[PDB]
């Protein structure tokens, strides 16, 4: 019986006095318990075009923007007019009171659970500054919580803004009267944070999310709702008809919150309107913005006096560019936030044949019709009246020379089905290209959106444009030499090597990072939209992103409309009620990486079992167990991170690219052991010691002898038998006590000569391992320094310090050594770090961090590299691909090569 009453109207009308029978939304209670929200001069309109819900009854008190917001938020809701989908219209007392009760009772018919306990708990809890965090103990004391909180929010008990692009999900506003008085008392109109602070970290963030206090600079807040109600005297550098371009936007009324929204949109993009980054001059009068880069490049967006919106730009190249980008941004803003004007909106293009005569206007649709069969207006080119219809504002190097195009559009020339078009195989300028054709009932808006994406962003991981036209309305971009990723996943499963699919993932992550850095949300990532140019893993370009027909500007305000293919979209996008940030793209990339790791897998199952693919996406199986793929540790972890319900828990695209940009990720191949099971030695199925295990001082695989050291059959205690602790063959050598010894006793190299260099304690220590190579690498107990000696001279050659490398990049004390045939040295420090040194140049290739807490024993098997470590107790067994140093070098070189391309494509 909890009904919501919202008395909306124009200030003064005496609607507050109407109920009794100015500083923000009020609230009262009436007995059928009625929750009344009494709304309130005109500054609050852009502050609360939000608090309408759906389960409420409206009482309008001839303002039409109010009705426009009502019919756009709560479509099915009674609206009773009172004098001083309309259901009744009364005039002014008690007779209308019965109508309200009758309408409220009929509204429930025209339009229970464990709620009532959480409702009471949230209502009966008083705190100062009432908003509270995720206080789960209040429900613990007394998969269904976000389904009850939503109902309570839609009932007036509290407000929970769970929209991803608000960052207010964690905190819960109690007794929502307070949030309608502290958020609406901040309001010539350029006040600073210092003054606000004298009346707060989340408070400033909360204000800007509601279009109340925009950030125009440090310690500065724009506060659009408080700007002057009249424009100053602007005298533009050009006043002749032939020198300016004018376009009007005629509306029945300005939507509630339209101008603050437009100002926010325009001031965020102004640095990048010419280049795509120099700041212009800006002015504000609450119904317009003046941008000014020069007397030749400016932009005046205002509102003449119904409800027209004028855009004035100079009639030059930079003026046309600014006009095009302002029109595109206004159209995008209207599509995102004001659906209902798209017809309630009329667009006029102003033109004149001779200078000095009155301006006459033509409807933009008629002008587009005339431009579809010509580029001149017959009683004065169209490029001077509406340059954006013929793409005259875009760069001239991407204009379609229709005489150089050999395009068939045959069913056998099809390449794929785009978002709103169809890509075909064609030839342009004597080259193999791909042409996208929009299907019959499309407008210039889709072309212009995909051109916004394709024209100003150049990245080695984004599809490149070659030409664009309007008469056939195509997009010639380029031909991917190897097709889409879906075809590779479902047909050519054999060519997908590990190092190739890692590059495929990395190139898509890099493209997403760049797309997000330019305030663009892709909104649909799938193997179909990922294009492959080569299957050679060492190439710089392996994967690109195409089909930008669903991409849209995603500024700090977010995006509301829902786009994306079922099964490749974030969970917050499937339920098209919240407004989401660019983390949906991160979730889509997580799904795509899951697909890459599992190859066909869930895609093959979804083409077999539809309408369950999208339902399973809120939990999906383990990649390894479900489809039997080879384990890819630290990539399954990234998949789990990217496949999280909370968008804020998900990493950003830059973080995903950073995680993927590591050779530890690709060369890792990690097996944990039971808790409190310590391992001393292992041999290669793998045999382990402790008690002899399988998956005691020494072991050996004799083609299993169990013991200080043992080789497949020499035994060392320090009495050797065909304290001694070292023996290796590469000739066979060894080490006894604190001196190196050899035999084919052949060469007793007593090693206390090195006491002069380094500490004597490190010099005179028991030997741990000896390595046989052109040189002699020796490390001792608790020795952060590895000694290098020459067999030919039986003399020291030089000492290397692991502590030096560790500090340059941490126990540092050497525990084990292993030599790789590619001239790389593996050293296991006392901590959980691994050092890769080139044997020749003595240079640090890379240090392995976050691996473990301590390294015990290290060896190689078959070709992989076995490292055993502790976690001080828990011991872990880790398998590293033995191509790790070369992979580090190749990955860093590849990153540099394709990074010097991103700064050259611009
Ligand atoms: C196998 C065959 C298939 N092929 C392609 C090419 C493409 C392609 N190229 N360029 C494009 C630009 C855009 C584009 O928009 C998509 C993603 C909407 C389909 C596709 C392509 N997409 C699939 N297959 C190229 C030939 C050589 O190989
Ligand atoms: N005498 C009289 N005063 C009215 C009438 N309607 C409105 N008012 C005046 O309008 C004021 C109410 O303003 P109100 O509409 O509640 O402001 P709002 O809540 O911010 O929209 C009261 O002070 C009344 O004096 C009316 O029919 N008769
Ligand atoms: Mg009032």
Numbering used by the authors: 1333 to 1353, 1368 to 1377, 1388 to 1396, 1398 to 1418, 1430 to 1452, 1481 to 1488, 1497 to 1515, 1528 to 1558, ...
Can you list sentences taken from the study reporting this PDB entry?
We chose the I2020T mutation because of the different properties exhibited by G2019S and I2020T despite affecting neighboring residues. Although the three structures—WT, G2019S, and I2020T—were very similar, two features were unique to LRRK2RCKW(G2019S):MLi-2. The second was an unexplained density we observed in the LRRK2RCKW(WT):MLi-2 and LRRK2RCKW(I2020T):MLi-2 cryo-EM maps, but not in that of LRRK2RCKW(G2019S):MLi-2. This additional density in WT and I2020T could accommodate an alternative rotamer for H1998, which closes the binding site around MLi-2. The cryo-EM maps of WT and I2020T showed density that could be accounted for by two different rotamers of H1998, while G2019S could only accommodate one. One of the rotamers in WT and I2020T, the one absent in G2019S, contributed to a larger MLi-2–binding interface that closed around the inhibitor. Next, we compared the kinase domains to see whether this difference in global conformation reflected differences in the states of the kinases themselves between LRRK2 and LRRK2RCKW. This was the case for MLi-2: While our structure of LRRK2RCKW(I2020T):MLi-2 showed an active-like, DYG “in”, αC “in” conformation with an ordered activation loop, the kinase in LRRK2(I2020T):MLi-2 had its αC in an “out” conformation and a disordered activation loop. As expected, the type I inhibitor MLi-2 led to a more closed kinase conformation in LRRK2 than the type II GZD-824 (left); the ROC domain in the MLi-2 structure is shifted toward the kinase by 3.4 Å as measured by the distance between the M1335 residues. This difference increased to 5.8 Å in LRRK2RCKW, where the N-terminal repeats are absent (right).
